[PDB]
Automatic annotation (TrEMBL), chain C:
Species assigned in the record: Trypanosoma brucei brucei (strain 927/4 GUTat10.1)
Gene Ontology terms: cellular component: mitochondrial small ribosomal subunit
Designated name of the protein: Uncharacterized protein
TrEMBL record, chain D:
Name of the molecule in the record: Uncharacterized protein
Organism superkingdom: Eukaryota
From TrEMBL, chain G:
Domain of life: Eukaryota
Protein name: Uncharacterized protein
Source organism: Trypanosoma brucei equiperdum
UniProtKB/TrEMBL annotation, chain K:
Domain of life according to the entry: Eukaryota
Function: Mitochondrial ribosome (mitoribosome) assembly factor. Binds at the interface of the head and body domains of the mitochondrial small ribosomal subunit (mt-SSU), occluding the mRNA channel and preventing compaction of the head domain towards the body. Probable inactive methyltransferase: retains the characteristic folding and ability to bind S-adenosyl-L-methionine, but it probably lost its methyltransferase activity.
Entry's localization field: Mitochondrion
Species this protein is from: Trypanosoma brucei gambiense (strain MHOM/CI/86/DAL972)
Residue segments, region Disordered: 1-20
Span within the parent record: 44 to 100 of 1041
Protein name stated in the entry: Methyltransferase
Length: 259, 89, 132, 144, 55, 205, 154, 60, 483, 154, 57
RNA sequence: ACCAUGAUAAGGAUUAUAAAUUGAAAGUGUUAAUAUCAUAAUCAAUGUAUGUGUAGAAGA
């Protein structure tokens, strides 16, 4: 495939799974985006002929409820469906387990790199986790060796969709005794969050990060911005910003010109 | 012998250069002592050719000569890439 | 003189950090060969023992880093087209990170090394003590 | 083949004394004779003159003989021929008939062999007769 | 010597053993074939198959 | 690309083609050889004197005979719990976000030394506490009537609280003094929460 | 030694980025191995550097495939870990080269370049006949002639 | 910080001086109207900044 | 496979056995075999090294069957027999802690037997005369790095272990191509090399203390100048000590007298066999690079513009002083050409360490120059015409000697702990190394040593890569079968 | 938090040492020496008054206040701003058991009781004996403070 | 982390980064920059006799 | 000489089912901003100091 100003992965994603791609495949004249031709048995079964349901027909319904009301059942089986069944491609192969190992991430989010709301929620979560960690369900408590566990902090995302509990052990040899038991608690932790902290942007997904002092933090937001302003190329930045202003004023003139 | 002088003297007794000249024999499962060779240079003459590009050219020449002497040697040599020509200037 | 960032920092280690270019020669090797021959024929082994001590102290196998521990410690992706800024940062970073501070190199009496002899006694210079 | 440097380094910028580079025109490149040094052409010409000087001095130190001009009669049979001047004919073999395939121009005669024609006036052997070892005699080498 | 070193020979990245061959960055870049390439190499045919065909 | 001009057979530049035939033949030979061939509890201890010399504590009671006792014996309230003997020093190391405390108690609950006060904080506090405690243990045992004995290390029960960084440093500090303090039970004291008293608003909202 | 001019330091990373050009130049590595062998000590860091560079040079023309992308990132983390391990072995051998070369120069009574430290002889920078008339860093007047670090007898 | 404020202001004055342009002083339709409203609401601030720069209504 | 912990060191008996290193270094470089014995129980296990160091034997113990075999000499014996050193490149292979190996070639055996006869020459005089064809000794010639210096070192070893007076002259360039030349104090028209002379006197005295101490000086004035407290010399050892032990510059003029009288007395002696071994006899034969001083420095001057002398204006080239005019070489030649002295045997060798020249020559860059300490002598040399000794021609190693020498080099280096060691799997096997180094060196000895060192650099050896690949695949399929 | 009472202690101790040396000089009846000591005391007071105000809210400042006030009173400086600040700080300075004793398993052999006689630290919370994490947490100098409670649970 | 070039000792220059590891007698680099800004506030004197008046020329 | 040149950045689809070859590549196809002198009557030019540049080379 030919990729221009975009990655080949994203290019194929757009040309396979997309509104204009699907419309062109169903046979609707669109120009800017095109579907991939002649994929044999490789095109998604959703868009194979004699399967799924026609989007050219589905354009006729203005609402999802109306589509549900008036849209006839899909054809259960097809030739491409038989090929997918023969190849075993009716359900993707299971990837390696990620719910029983820690996140070996690149950086470690800085205390100044998170919104104040996320920061607030984080210290509350850390307080309650440290207070209640011994009152975990008995069938996990009986095997967790609390003598070794340590939790440095909890970081989480902006608006706390995700929480990252940074933990390690006194002796490094205990990480592989402690990790699975710790990952068996990610539901108990969510219930603790629901029960104890009342100002939560929303109940998050819990993820454990092992950092025995090995990982390295990020730079402060202000220091990073100062470094960027200090070393950035002034000529290119000025030209780009002037072009941006030119485009903004052009759009404003178009808006004012349309009566 | 390269241009009337022993290889150890032409390539200035450099192990990493003469082993390329040896490579076509080893890849072919052959004994270098069963064959005696002479390499003549038609390129830009220089006082010393003790460099990797010259060694590459010598290895390619030896490999081609071996191929034409005994055709069945062309199997391991092409697979090893001694018959392939680099295009870099 | 004009102050610069070429400070040698002689305080630490046997070699001044950001060390000056050091170039060896075959004449140096010949002089070393003659010096070693004369020392071996005169029986002086104190300098050999000191050389082995330095080799043992500074020639251990570096510890395999643990995941997450990376080599630059600084993004180095922000100096976009600022090659001189990147070069100054690299000079200063490698000047700060000194061999005395090279934690990942096991060095000191706390280390055990079955590869090299530690006590100058168990060397072939002392071979009549080994004969029961 | 020679491993010594023949060309002068190019000047495209000011170099420094670094790990893999040295200052241009330092007292290390051509034996310290760069202290005399502009134009790459004239600099290369001077370096060529120095290289030719080195070639000449080693070529003359390699020379251990002398070119006494001997009359035709008092001369070995191999040199009793007509010898073309240098670069006039094919490199001449001394005598293919007697299996002596060797450049006649490079032949060197031991001085203790022409005492019969050199120094004909001195009735005493200024140079004692040359001692030649016997090949057909059991010696330490031939004993095993 | 070679037959003993064959069993002493390391196979994991450890102490003085390490995959500097781009296997971590590039992966398996060296081919390795279990079949004799017809004109050059030879391995005797298996006797189970020989007997099957003869029978 | 920078190396677009080099051949694909030189990109990896395969080598050693002369070994493949040998490997195939050797594999077949070893398969034939295999077909032809086809056709942890701990150590043992036996002597009582040896056990005593090896472990530093005699197994046989070797004490006064209190024979002819009652025919039924009462159990301990906590049978399964570890056997804390009289001469064990119980040191508690409590960690927090900003601070770390270390105290040491006698087998009877008597405090030996006052409290002392991140990872480095805990390490230093513990090291200083141990250094100052060893002499205090000397004097307390001497007053009791127990001489140290040359090289006899104090038997220690270390108990840690707080899921904070300082725990690693404090335990490393206790470990660094192994030659004098012999840790026999390392355990945790982080309390099980209950209804408990009210908590600050900042924790909740 | 005959390189007695004031010099410029270079970070070990940029020294090692040369690789086959100068850092791992085979002739230079061979004569470093010869120095170590004559001194009578094992060339283990040197051999680690040699095999590292051989295997890297064996692939330097291969472009890595575009990574599909794994959230766990264990693959990228391991790749970086091994890269940094190799870099650290090369740093160790780099430091060893300088250390033993200065030791040998001190042994053979060879004067180093300006602002070079020899542990036994000149702890601070040795400066002899520099363009700047005073110490480059200590701001003191160097004597005429340059200080003799060693004795006079040959 | 000096370079940051310079890099922030100089584009405005340079555009004003050199790059300033000349001046001469039903459900589907409803959903399209909504999408246009959405884009303009998302980019309200910088469009207002551009119009203010054009109209010279900005407090330095 | 971890048979290292089960390995117990053998009993140390010699310096060679003491050269052994911790098992962690040579585990795998020298794999350990296991031998089961039935001693006081059917099962036993003795983990032993497959390879052991070559034996440390004396020249007397060396035999005919040892030809093309490697032996060793203890460090103490080395220091005893070589105070002056090991001329040439022979000590290149003997760093501190390394065994001091030595090949035993056919020429080495011939020389050992000849020295055996020299030990009692007066009875074997006819045998010696027939062996040398009547010439006063042998001169060893051959290509570069061929082993002439090693053979002379072995000859000196043989003679000094048999307790005969030996005049060993390593690196005859120290004499001919010395540092500075000085006219002889007592020999008019003859020149000296005082530094080399004093060093030679020291080393000769310490080497031959026993015989020199037992010596009695016959023709030597006993009124030699002497400082307070020093006893006048009475034996040749004390003569050498008086010559070389003195304060500068008083040693410069004393060494000339000492060497002149030592040469005179050695020429006089007619009973003790004296073996004279010199490395590079061509240097003593043709010339020394020193030139005669310009006569202006001798005549004397009043003012410079007066005589219009150009000594400081233009350099010149005075005739080179021939090596015959030195006092040491004068004694040697006096003893050589003058008959009636069947008591001194000259086992000399030539040298070929000259700088290379092949038609053109630039300037060798200082940092990368393996001929930096080579000799500026491009003139040819023919031993038969340029010397009175019987010439012996040596060539490069034949496959037998080459295999033995490379086996010793590699295996003993790794055993002593200076080779690949734990990284043995990074290097090919001994057969591949032998084949490749033979190709690269032509079985030349010096080339073999150089390429043994350069083997660190080989980049086109895929044997270990393919071996690891095959063994990993075999193990993986075995585990998959087991599952 | 990388704050060192080094220089503040160094300044204060000099003031106290001069304060003592002044009594000693007056007892020796050396008028010139005591006048010089008084002059130097004023000189050092002027340079010390800024270190005091910057560090007046530190623990180390809380303990030398009365001794420094005694020094100033001995020197008879009663209108000094530092005297007034010392007066203010000194003025501010001057102004649940369980039904049945039970022992947790984590305090098995003999629970360590901080005998009720000893008073717990100034800023600390006296919690019920039932809702104690552990008797060590009710230890007097380990007792949770209010601000420490706001941050960590136990 | 690495505290070998973190702080600036007043004695040394700004580019001559100090090798000292102590903390007490050091000022941070932001403070060094502020001090240099507050210190470089003087003009080199303008030569009066060196250059002649434009009207004179 | 007052013509309607033209540079500048921006849009894109097509092609490996081979393990051969010294080499497994090139064809193909888009919006703005900027710019446009020539059918006419001439004329010798302590306390202390950091640059851009130039030459070689988060797919909200
Ligand atoms: N141990 C040992 N080494 C040998 C022997 N023969 C040659 N060599 C090696 O060869 C190297 C060079 O020494 P020689 O071959 O004797 O040198 P040469 O014969 O004087 O020839 P030139 O170098 O031209 O003067 C030495 O470093 C030895 O290690 C031998 O018989 N035994
Ligand atoms: Mg020699």
């Amino acid at each position: 495939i030919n990729s221009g100003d975009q990655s080949p992965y994203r290019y194929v994603e757009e040309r396979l799974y997309s509104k204009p791609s699907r419309l062109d495949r169903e046979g609707v004249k669109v120009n800017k985006t095109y579907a991939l031709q002649g994929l044999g048995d490789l095109e998604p079964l959703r868009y194979g002929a004699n399967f799924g349901i026609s989007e050219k027909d589905a354009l006729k319904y203005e609402t999802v409820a109306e589509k549900a009301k008036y849209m006839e059942p899909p054809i259960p089986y097809s030739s491409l469906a038989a090929r997918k069944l023969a190849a075993g491609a009716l359900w993707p192969a299971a990837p390696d387990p990620e719910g029983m190992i820690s996140k070996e991430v690149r950086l470690l989010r800085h205390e100044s790199s998170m919104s104040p709301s996320a920061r607030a929620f984080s210290e509350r979560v850390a307080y309650h986790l440290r207070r209640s960690l011994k009152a975990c369900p008995g069938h996990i408590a009986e095997h967790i060796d609390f003598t070794q566990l340590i939790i440095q902090e909890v970081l989480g995302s902006r608006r706390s969709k995700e929480i990252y509990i940074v933990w390690f052990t006194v002796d490094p040899g205990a990480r592989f005794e402690l990790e699975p038991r710790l990952h068996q608690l990610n539901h108990w932790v969510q219930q603790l969050i629901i029960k104890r902290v009342k100002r939560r942007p929303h109940i998050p997904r819990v993820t454990w990060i092992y950092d025995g002092g090995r990982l390295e933090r990020e730079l402060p937001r202000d220091v990073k911005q100062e470094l960027q302003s200090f070393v950035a190329d002034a000529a290119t930045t000025l030209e780009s910003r002037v072009k941006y202003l030119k485009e903004l004023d052009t759009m404003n003139q178009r808006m004012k010109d349309i009566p | 012998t390269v241009m009337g002088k022993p290889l150890s003297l032409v390539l200035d007794n450099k192990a990493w250069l003469m082993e390329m000249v040896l490579m076509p024999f080893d890849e072919a499962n052959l004994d270098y002592r069963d064959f005696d060779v002479h390499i003549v240079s038609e390129g830009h003459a220089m006082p010393s050719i003790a460099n990797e590009i010259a060694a590459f050219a010598l290895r390619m020449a030896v490999a081609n000569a071996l191929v034409k002497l005994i055709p069945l040697t062309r199997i391991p040599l092409k697979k090893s890439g001694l018959l392939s020509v680099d295009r870099r200037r | 003189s004009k102050p610069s960032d070429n400070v040698a920092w002689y305080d630490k280690g046997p070699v001044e950090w950001l060390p000056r270019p050091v170039r060896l020669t075959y004449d140096h090797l010949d002089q070393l060969q003659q010096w070693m021959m004369r020392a071996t024929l005169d029986g002086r082994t104190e300098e050999f023992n000191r050389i082995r001590d330095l080799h043992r102290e500074w020639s251990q196998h570096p510890l395999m880093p643990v995941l997450g521990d990376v080599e630059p410690k600084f993004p180095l992706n922000l100096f976009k087209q600022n090659h001189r800024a990147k070069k100054r940062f690299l000079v200063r970073w490698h000047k700060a990170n000194t061999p005395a501070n090279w934690l990942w190199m096991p060095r000191g009496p706390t280390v055990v090394t079955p590869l090299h002899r530690t006590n100058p006694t168990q060397y072939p210079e002392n071979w009549k003590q080994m004969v029961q | 083949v020679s491993t010594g440097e023949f060309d002068h380094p190019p000047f495209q910028f000011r170099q420094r004394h670094t790990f893999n580079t040295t200052p241009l025109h330092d007292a290390n490149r051509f034996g310290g004779r760069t202290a005399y040094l502009k134009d790459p052409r004239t600099v290369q010409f001077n370096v060529d003159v120095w290289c030719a000087q080195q070639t000449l001095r080693k070529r003359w130190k390699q020379r251990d003989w002398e070119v006494i001009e001997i009359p035709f009669r008092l001369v070995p049979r191999e040199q009793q021929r007509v010898i073309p001047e240098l670069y006039t004919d094919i490199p001449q073999m001394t005598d293919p008939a007697r299996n002596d395939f060797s450049n006649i121009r490079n032949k060197v005669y031991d001085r203790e062999e022409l005492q019969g024609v050199l120094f004909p006036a001195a009735g005493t052997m200024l140079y004692p007769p040359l001692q030649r070892v016997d090949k057909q005699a059991m010696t330490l080498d031939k004993y095993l | 010597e070679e037959r003993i070193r064959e069993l002493m020979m390391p196979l994991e990245v450890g102490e003085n053993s390490f995959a500097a061959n781009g296997q971590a960055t590039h992966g398996n870049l060296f081919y390795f074939r279990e079949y004799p390439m017809y004109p050059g190499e030879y391995v005797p045919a298996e006797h189970n198959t020989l007997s099957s065909l003869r029978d | 690309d920078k190396y677009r001009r080099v051949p694909m057979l030189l990109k990896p530049q395969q080598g050693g083609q002369q070994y493949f035939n040998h490997f195939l033949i050797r594999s077949t030979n070893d398969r034939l050889t295999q077909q032809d061939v086809d056709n942890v509890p701990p150590p043992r201890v036996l002597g009582g004197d040896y056990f005593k010399t090896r472990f530093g504590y005699s197994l046989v009671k070797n004490s006064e005979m209190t024979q002819g006792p009652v025919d039924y014996s009462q159990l301990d309230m906590w049978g399964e719990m570890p056997r804390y003997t009289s001469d064990m020093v119980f040191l508690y190391l409590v960690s927090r976000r900003r601070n770390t405390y270390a105290v040491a108690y006698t087998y009877e609950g008597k405090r030996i030394l006052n409290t002392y006060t991140s990872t480095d904080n805990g390490h230093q506090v513990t090291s200083m506490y141990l250094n100052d405690l060893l002499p205090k243990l000397r004097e307390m045992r001497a007053s009791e009537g127990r001489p140290m004995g040359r090289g006899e290390k104090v038997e220690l029960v270390v108990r840690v609280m707080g899921f904070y960084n300082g725990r690693q440093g404090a335990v490393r500090a206790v470990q660094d003094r192994a030659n004098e303090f012999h840790v026999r039970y390392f355990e945790d004291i982080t309390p099980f929460p209950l209804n408990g008293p009210k908590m600050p608003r900042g924790v909740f909202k | 030694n005959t390189f007695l001019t004031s010099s410029v330091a270079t970070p070990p990373i940029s020294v090692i980025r040369t690789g086959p050009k100068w850092w791992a130049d085979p002739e230079r590595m061979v004569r470093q191995k010869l120095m170590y062998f004559t001194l009578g000590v094992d060339q283990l860091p040197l051999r680690r550097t040699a095999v590292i560079q051989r295997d890297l040079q064996r692939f330097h023309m291969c472009k890595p495939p575009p990574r599909v992308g794994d959230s766990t990132g264990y693959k990228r983390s391991r790749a970086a870990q091994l890269n940094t391990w190799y870099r650290r072995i090369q740093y160790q051998e780099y430091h060893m080269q300088h250390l033993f070369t200065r030791h040998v120069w001190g042994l053979l009574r060879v004067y180093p370049g300006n602002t070079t430290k020899i542990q036994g002889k000149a702890d601070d920078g040795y400066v002899g006949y520099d363009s700047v008339p005073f110490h480059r860093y200590n701001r003191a007047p160097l004597p005429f002639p340059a200080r003799e670090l060693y004795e006079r007898r040959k | 910080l000096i370079r940051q404020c310079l890099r922030d202001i100089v584009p405005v004055i340079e555009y004003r001086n050199r790059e300033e342009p000349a001046r001469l002083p039903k459900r589907s339709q409803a959903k399209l109207r909504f999408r246009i409203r959405q884009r303009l609401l998302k980019f309200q601030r910088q469009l207002a900044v551009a119009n203010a720069i054009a109209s010279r209504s900005v407090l330095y | 496979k971890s048979l290292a912990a089960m390995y117990m060191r053998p009993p140390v008996t010699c310096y060679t056995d003491a050269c052994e290193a911790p098992v962690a270094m040579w585990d795998g470089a020298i794999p350990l075999k296991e031998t089961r014995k039935l001693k006081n129980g059917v099962p036993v296990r003795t983990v032993s090294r497959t390879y052991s160091h070559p034996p440390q034997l004396t020249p007397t113990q060396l035999s005919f069957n040892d030809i093309n075999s490697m032996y060793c000499v203890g460090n103490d014996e080395l220091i005893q027999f070589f105070p002056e050193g090991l001329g040439g490149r022979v000590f290149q292979t003997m760093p501190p802690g390394h065994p001091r190996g030595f090949l035993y070639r056919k020429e080495t055996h011939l020389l050992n037997l000849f020295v055996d006869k020299v030990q009692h020459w007066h009875t074997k005089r006819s045998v010696l005369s027939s062996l040398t064809n009547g010439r006063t000794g042998f001169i060893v010639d051959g290509p570069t790095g061929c082993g002439k210096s090693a053979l002379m070192c072995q000859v000196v070893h043989f003679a000094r272990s048999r307790n005969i007076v030996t005049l060993y002259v390593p690196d005859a360039k120290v004499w001919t191509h010395g540092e500075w030349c000085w006219p002889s104090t007592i020999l008019p028209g003859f020149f000296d090399a005082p530094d080399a002379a004093r060093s030679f006197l020291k080393y000769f005295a310490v080497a031959n203390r026993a015989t020199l101490t037992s010596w009695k000086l016959r023709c030597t004035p006993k009124d030699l100048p002497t400082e307070q407290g020093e006893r006048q010399p009475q034996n040749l050892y004390e003569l050498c000590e008086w010559g070389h032990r003195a304060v500068a510059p008083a040693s410069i003029d004393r060494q000339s007298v000492c060497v002149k009288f030592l040469m005179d007395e050695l020429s006089e002696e007619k009973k003790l066999p004296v073996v004279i071994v010199v490395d590079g006899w061509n240097l003593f034969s043709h010339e020394t690079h020193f030139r005669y001083p310009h006569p202006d420095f001798l005549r004397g001057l009043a003012s410079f513009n007066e005589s219009s002398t150009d000594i400081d204006l233009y350099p010149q080239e005075l005739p080179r002083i021939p090596a015959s005019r030195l006092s040491f070489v004068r004694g040697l030649n006096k003893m050589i050409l003058s008959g009636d002295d069947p008591n001194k045997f000259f086992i000399t060798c030539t040298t070929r360490d000259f700088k290379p020249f092949d038609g053109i020559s630039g300037f060798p860059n200082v940092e990368t120059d393996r001929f930096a300490n080579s000799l500026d002598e491009y003139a040819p040399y023919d031993p038969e015409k340029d010397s009175h000794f019987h010439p012996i021609q040596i060539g490069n190693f034949d496959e037998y000697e080459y295999r033995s020498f490379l086996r010793f080099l590699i295996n003993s280096g790794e055993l002593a702990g200076l080779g690949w060691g734990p990284l043995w799997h990074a290097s090919s096997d001994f057969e591949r190394k032998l084949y490749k180094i033979g190709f690269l060196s032509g079985r030349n000895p010096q080339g073999v040593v150089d390429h043994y060192h350069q083997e660190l650099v080989w980049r086109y050896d895929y044997q270990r890569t393919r071996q690891k690949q095959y063994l990993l695949k075999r193990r993986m399929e075995g585990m998959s079968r087991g599952a | 938090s990388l704050h060192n009472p080094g220089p503040f202690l160094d300044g204060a101790l000099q003031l106290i040492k001069l304060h003592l040396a002044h009594k000693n000089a007056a007892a020796d009846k050396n008028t010139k020496a005591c006048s010089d000591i008084e002059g130097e005391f004023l000189r050092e007071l002027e340079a010390f008054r800024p270190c005091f105000t910057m560090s007046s809210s530190l623990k180390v400042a809380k303990l030398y206040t009365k001794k420094l006030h005694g020094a100033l009173s001995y020197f008879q400086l009663y209108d000094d701003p530092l005297m007034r600040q010392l007066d203010m700080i000194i003025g501010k300075q001057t102004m649940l058991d369980e039904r049945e004793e039970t022992v947790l398993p984590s305090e098995l052999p003999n629970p360590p009781k901080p005998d009720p006689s000893t008073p717990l630290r100034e800023r600390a919370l006296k919690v019920p004996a039932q809702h104690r994490g552990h008797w060590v947490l009710r230890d007097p100098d380990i007792a949770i403070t209010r601000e420490e409670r706001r941050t960590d649970p136990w | 982390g690495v505290l070998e070039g973190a702080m600036h000792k007043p004695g040394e220059s700004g580019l001559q980064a100090g090798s000292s590891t102590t903390i007490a007698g050091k000022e941070t680099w932001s403070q060094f920059s502020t001090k240099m800004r507050y210190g470089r506030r003087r003009i080199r004197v303008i030569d009066v006799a060196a250059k002649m008046s434009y009207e004179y020329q």
